[PDB]
């Protein structure tokens, strides 16, 4: 794993440092100043990406070449953070994270990893807002489910009636209802079911 803490570092310096770290030979045409703080440790992929993002911001692209050569051609603090996501696909968040960066101005970037973590590079304020949203959606797709059997009333009927005003599904086999929520919600929904029964 890897780490980055640069404060008004000359671009050439920055490039050389990341190069040695990644075991990559670097070529340059390249003026600029770099600043970034790693909030979390990064693996080789994520670190490489951070390097690619910061260059892009400064107006530069990488061209990967023959035997591993690369050619280059408080709320305001520039930070990078990796956010693991546990209960939902990272790409299901892309639309609303695109909405978020559209209200945030330029310089901020959301990258998605095939291992299902999101990496955020940008200003601490923006990066905090992106973290909040991700964590909120990820926690929402984790709602514990409960089966509630009914002695008297009909399973289908109760589900239809409640679902008309609001997830609630029936299973006529066992005359039961499945309720998908959290301890606050499920406790209130249970009593309503019992009372209907």
């Amino acid at each position: 794993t890897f780490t980055a803490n640069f404060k008004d570092t000359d671009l050439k310096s920055f490039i050389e440092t990341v190069g040695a770290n990644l075991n990559k030979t670097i070529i340059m045409g390249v003026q600029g100043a770099v600043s970034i703080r790693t909030m979390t440790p990064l693996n080789e992929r994520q670190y490489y990406q951070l390097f690619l993002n910061l260059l892009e911001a400064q107006g530069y692209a990488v061209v990967p070449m023959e035997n591993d050569v690369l050619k280059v051609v408080a709320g305001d603090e520039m930070v990078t953070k990796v956010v693991p996501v546990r209960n939902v696909s990272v790409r299901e968040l892309a639309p609303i994270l695109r909405q978020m960066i559209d209200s945030a101005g330029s310089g901020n970037v959301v990258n998605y990893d095939p291992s299902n973590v999101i990496m955020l590079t940008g200003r601490a304020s923006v990066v905090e807002r992106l973290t909040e949203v991700i964590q909120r959606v990820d926690h929402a797709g984790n709602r514990t489910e409960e089966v509630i059997p009914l002695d008297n009333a009909s399973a289908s009927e109760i589900a239809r009636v409640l679902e008309s005003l609001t997830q609630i599904v029936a299973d006529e086999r066992t005359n039961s209802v499945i309720v998908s929520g959290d301890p606050a919600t499920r406790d209130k929904m249970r009593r309503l079911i019992r009372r209907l029964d």
Epitope: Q46, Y48, Q49, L52, P64, A94, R98, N111, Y112, P114
Partner: nanobody, 120 residues
Framework: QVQLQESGGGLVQAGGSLRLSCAAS????????MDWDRQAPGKQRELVAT???????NYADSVKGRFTISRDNAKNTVYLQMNSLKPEDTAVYYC??????????????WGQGTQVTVSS
């Protein structure tokens, strides 16, 4: 990097039709998926339709049958044919390119958007 330019929006009566166009440029080789999403003021931006680089297509429940996404690689352009339009479809439509980076992650690039309005 990839750069995207939308067009084709406008005002249309319910039941009418529009064709959105989006011309991509830059690192076309990195694009591994292109999608259209839309956003009305006060609501979540949501995904409408997607076309992968292999040509697979995805459609949101609300638009399936009415909307067709398509592609013309000679012009590097993807289209959204919007038939049987309802007021519900009034939104700014964005064209978004999902690309692969040299690092192996993915990144979105998208455009300023084209506004669609559907009157009753």
């Amino acid at each position: 990097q990839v750069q995207l330019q939308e067009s084709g929006g406008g005002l249309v009566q319910a039941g009418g039709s529009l064709r959105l166009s989006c011309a991509a440029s830059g690192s076309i080789f990195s694009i591994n998926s292109m999608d259209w999403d839309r956003q009305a003021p006060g609501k979540q931006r949501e995904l409408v339709a997607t076309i992968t680089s292999g040509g697979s297509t995805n459609y949101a429940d609300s638009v399936k049958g009415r909307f067709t996404i398509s592609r013309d690689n000679a012009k590097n352009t993807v289209y959204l044919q919007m038939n049987s339009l309802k007021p519900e479809d009034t939104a700014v439509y964005y064209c978004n390119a999902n690309v692969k980076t040299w690092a192996g992650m993915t990144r979105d690039y998208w455009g300023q958007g084209t506004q669609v309005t559907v009157s009753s």
